């Protein structure tokens, strides 16, 4: 397919939004902006500190771009958590996003990882040094079980990045590779457990639902992301590996077949998500429904995924899908589309220079 599956894409997206029950929220734009700025402001000051500035080797521009995409992701999806929680999660997920930027071999700095860890010595790898120092600010919002999940997933993520450094799409015939890697760097368990602050949820009382939420949320979150990202990544000769591209290489199937597989998982995942949590604790179903919706809004509104382009193409096309799509889009935009100038300021560099 030298061309983007525009039709096919539009279809599944609508089906997906329908399945999850994509609709309006009592989360106003004035509320969204309130939070966006709160989160961004705390994070910005954090990354602007000299220590963070030294140890984190990231280009100023990308750091700004990353922080902004992450604050957005967090505020729009963790709708029911506190302002401080959105902020702290924003800092954590910004660190993770930034690590996918390093080309640097982890190996030499990981040689004494466990011995330093057990001894309480600052880690050799600067990233760990920063993240582990910051971690308590995130972990304070959760109980021990949810905390353990955040810790593991982040550790899993670190290995994932390491593996990704080899741009390996898996050996042909290695069917278990693709999902193995995707889970490794999807932060699924991190996301899943960070949805339940101990301030508004009892980890022990809701242990079974939380666990189930983590288990199911992990795959939904990553597959929805892989799907929504399929468009930007299509003509990106720079991005060589991805769940879909890897299915292709490892499963030895066509890109169509691979994209096919993703869609079946995504939709089935959606259907089962609702099936399971509808009749459960209302507060749980609420956090979950909001995350799914917010997560979708975010993808549709953040420039990174460039979905606006797909809009301004089928904008006046008159097929069923086409319209149901554009309708959903505009819905998002209403509370989603927000000029950065309304919340993301001043730039991190400016704060860093002061
Ligand atoms: Mg990729």
UniProtKB/Swiss-Prot annotation:
Known outcome of mutating residue 190 to F: Increases the KM for farnesyl diphosphate by about 1.3-fold and reduces the kcat by about 2000-fold
Induction per the UniProt record: Expression is positively regulated by the trichothecene cluster-specific transcription activator TRI10. Expression is induced between 18h and 21h growth on GYEP medium. The initial detection of trichothecenes occurs several hours after the initial detection of TRI5. The initiation of trichothecene biosynthesis occurs with a high concentration of glucose remaining in the culture medium.
Consequence recorded when altering residue 146 to F: Leads to the loss of activity
Pathway in which this enzyme or protein is active: Sesquiterpene biosynthesis; trichothecene biosynthesis
InterPro entries linked: Isoprenoid_synthase_dom_sf, TRI5_ascomyc, Trichodiene_synth
Region of interest: Aspartate-rich domain: 100-104
Activity versus pH, per record: Optimum pH is 6.75-7.75.
EC number: 4.2.3.6
BP terms from Gene Ontology: sesquiterpenoid biosynthetic process
Primary role: Trichodiene synthase; part of the core gene cluster that mediates the biosynthesis of trichothecenes, a very large family of chemically related bicyclic sesquiterpene compounds acting as mycotoxins, including T2-toxin. The biosynthesis of trichothecenes begins with the cyclization of farnesyl diphosphate to trichodiene and is catalyzed by the trichodiene synthase TRI5. Trichodiene undergoes a series of oxygenations catalyzed by the cytochrome P450 monooxygenase TRI4.
Other known facts: Trichothecenes are sesquiterpenoid toxins that act by inhibiting protein biosynthesis.
Entry protein name: Trichodiene synthase
């Amino acid at each position: 397919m030298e061309n983007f599956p525009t039709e096919y894409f539009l279809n599944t997206t609508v089906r997906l939004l329908e399945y999850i029950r994509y609709r309006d929220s009592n989360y106003t734009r004035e509320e969204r902006i309130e939070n966006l700025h709160y989160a961004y402001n705390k994070a910005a000051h954090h990354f602007a500190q000299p220590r963070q500035q030294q140890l984190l080797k990231v280009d100023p521009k990308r750091l700004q771009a990353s922080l902004q995409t992450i604050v957005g992701m967090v505020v729009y999806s963790w709708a029911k958590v506190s302002k401080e929680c959105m902020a702290d999660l924003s800092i954590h997920y910004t660190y993770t996003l930034v690590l996918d930027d390093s080309k640097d071999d982890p190996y030499p700095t990981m040689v004494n990882y466990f011995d330093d860890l057990q001894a309480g010595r600052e880690q050799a790898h600067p990233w760990w040094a920063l993240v582990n120092e910051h971690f308590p600010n995130v972990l304070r919002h959760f109980g021990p079980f949810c905390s353990l999940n955040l810790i593991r997933s982040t550790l899993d993520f670190f290995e994932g990045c390491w593996i990704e450094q080899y741009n390996f799409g898996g050996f042909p015939g290695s069917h278990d590779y693709p999902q193995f890697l995707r889970r490794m760097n999807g932060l699924g368990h991190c996301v899943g457990a960070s949805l339940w602050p101990k301030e508004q949820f009892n980890e022990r009382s809701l242990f079974l639902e939380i666990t189930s939420a983590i288990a199911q949320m992990e795959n939904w979150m990553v597959w929805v992301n892989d799907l929504m990202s399929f468009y930007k990544e299509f003509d990106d000769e720079r991005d060589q590996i991805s769940l879909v591209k890897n299915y292709v290489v490892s499963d030895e199937i066509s890109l169509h077949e691979a994209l096919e597989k993703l869609t079946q998982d995504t939709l089935h995942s959606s259907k089962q998500m609702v099936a399971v949590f509808s009749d459960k604790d209302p507060q749980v179903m609420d956090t979950i429904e909001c995350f799914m919706h917010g997560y979708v809004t975010w993808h549709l509104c953040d420039r990174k995924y460039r979905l606006s382009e797909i809009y301004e193409k089928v904008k006046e096309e008159k097929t069923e899908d086409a319209q149901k799509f554009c309708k959903f889009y505009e819905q998002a935009a209403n509370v989603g589309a927000v000029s950065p100038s309304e919340w993301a300021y001043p730039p991190v560099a400016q704060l860093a220079n002061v």
